[PDB]
Design an enzyme around this catalytic site. Structure first.
Site, PDB file in Angstrom:
ATOM      1  N   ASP A  82      39.508  53.401  34.715  1.00  0.00           N
ATOM      2  CA  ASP A  82      39.972  52.001  35.168  1.00  0.00           C
ATOM      3  C   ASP A  82      39.014  51.543  36.643  1.00  0.00           C
ATOM      4  O   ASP A  82      40.468  52.228  37.788  1.00  0.00           O
ATOM      5  CB  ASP A  82      41.062  51.463  34.298  1.00  0.00           C
ATOM      6  CG  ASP A  82      41.798  50.270  35.004  1.00  0.00           C
ATOM      7  OD1 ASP A  82      40.087  49.289  35.281  1.00  0.00           O
ATOM      8  OD2 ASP A  82      42.480  49.238  34.700  1.00  0.00           O
ATOM      9  N   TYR A  93      31.624  34.656  42.386  1.00  0.00           N
ATOM     10  CA  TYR A  93      31.050  35.521  41.827  1.00  0.00           C
ATOM     11  C   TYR A  93      30.162  35.741  43.332  1.00  0.00           C
ATOM     12  O   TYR A  93      30.845  37.304  43.875  1.00  0.00           O
ATOM     13  CB  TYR A  93      29.522  35.758  40.681  1.00  0.00           C
ATOM     14  CG  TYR A  93      28.502  37.121  40.584  1.00  0.00           C
ATOM     15  CD1 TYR A  93      29.501  38.348  40.489  1.00  0.00           C
ATOM     16  CD2 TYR A  93      27.583  36.813  40.813  1.00  0.00           C
ATOM     17  CE1 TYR A  93      28.628  39.184  40.423  1.00  0.00           C
ATOM     18  CE2 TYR A  93      27.008  37.874  41.034  1.00  0.00           C
ATOM     19  CZ  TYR A  93      27.549  39.496  40.722  1.00  0.00           C
ATOM     20  OH  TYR A  93      25.919  40.581  40.058  1.00  0.00           O
TER      21      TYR A  93
END
Length: 287
Positions: free
Chosen positions: A39, A131
């Protein structure tokens, strides 16, 4: 110092998978991680993997890319992955002395450039999407923490090994006779194979560290509509060109994010046109 040791993050996405298979062809070893192994949002898990692997070269293919979702329902996830995750990998690479290849986006630019003009690596980013904002912060983290880096800004990415605009178009076309695609957002497709080969070209040939723009090329102006018309040309659907005002979109996407590819071409790497790449993508998908 004598052994190269490659780590690929985001290894099971469309780009990471492409890259694994390219390295496999070239007989190059690597360690591959994605979300079920490492992760990137957890600095301790990142540290533990780097402590075991001791990479000298990291291809960072992990990102959150759902532009509209990043404005709202995915805003938190976009920030975790693209800001925090980028920082974590940049810091790990600096700690370990690894070269970091960071994939970024044409969406760092504001898009206010006339049709026909192109963005160069030294233009000032001023992203107007969540983004793009996050990806620019990622770039800045890379530059702060990884002394040895390549930041490759890419666009409109597609390939056989994960979700993308091509597969979205094909799926929609199965059940719908008419699709509406913007014809006032200018940019260029990028096949994951071309991008993976460029990533490896930079590292194999030890080009100068820094920023590089990489998409597939085009002789003429290209919009999403142009790309969709070509993808769907063998299907019973009508692709309808619309403006960006036609439907209320969450993200204010850049009107012209076409990149100047001259720096990439100056490396010696040869860039296919998007039309050529799309054709190759269809052939590779037969296997």
């Amino acid at each position: 110092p004598l052994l190269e040791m490659i780590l690929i993050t985001g290894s099971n996405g469309q780009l990471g998978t492409e890259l694994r298979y390219l390295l496999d062809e070239r007989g190059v070893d690597y360690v591959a991680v994605d979300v079920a192994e490492m992760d990137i949002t957890n600095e301790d898990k990142v540290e533990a993997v780097f402590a075991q692997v001791k990479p000298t070269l990291v291809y960072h293919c992990a990102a959150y890319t759902a532009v509209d979702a990043a404005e709202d329902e995915g805003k938190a996830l976009n920030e975790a992955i693209n800001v925090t995750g980028s920082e974590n990998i940049a810091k790990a690479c600096g700690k370990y002395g690894a070269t970091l290849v960071y994939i970024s986006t044409d969406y760092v630019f504001d898009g206010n450039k006339p049709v026909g003009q192109e963005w160069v690596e030294t233009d000032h980013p001023d992203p107007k999407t969540e983004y793009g904002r996050t990806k620019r912060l990622g770039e800045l983290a890379v530059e702060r923490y990884a002394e040895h880096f390549y930041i490759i800004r890419t666009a409109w990415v597609f390939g056989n090994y994960g979700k993308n605009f091509v597969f979205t178009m094909e799926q929609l076309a199965e059940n719908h006779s008419r699709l509406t695609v913007v014809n006032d957002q200018h940019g260029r497709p990028t096949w994951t194979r071309t991008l993976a080969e460029f990533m490896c070209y930079l590292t194999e040939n030890q080009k100068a560290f820094g920023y590089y723009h990489l998409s597939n090329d085009a002789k003429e102006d290209t919009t999403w509509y142009d790309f969709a018309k070509e993808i769907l040309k063998d299907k019973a659907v009508e692709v309808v060109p619309v403006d960006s005002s036609a439907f209320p979109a969450k993200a204010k996407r850049p009107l012209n994010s076409t990149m100047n590819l001259d720096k990439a071409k100056a490396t010696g790497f040869v860039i296919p046109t998007w039309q050529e790449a799309l054709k190759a993508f269809y052939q590779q998908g037969l296997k």
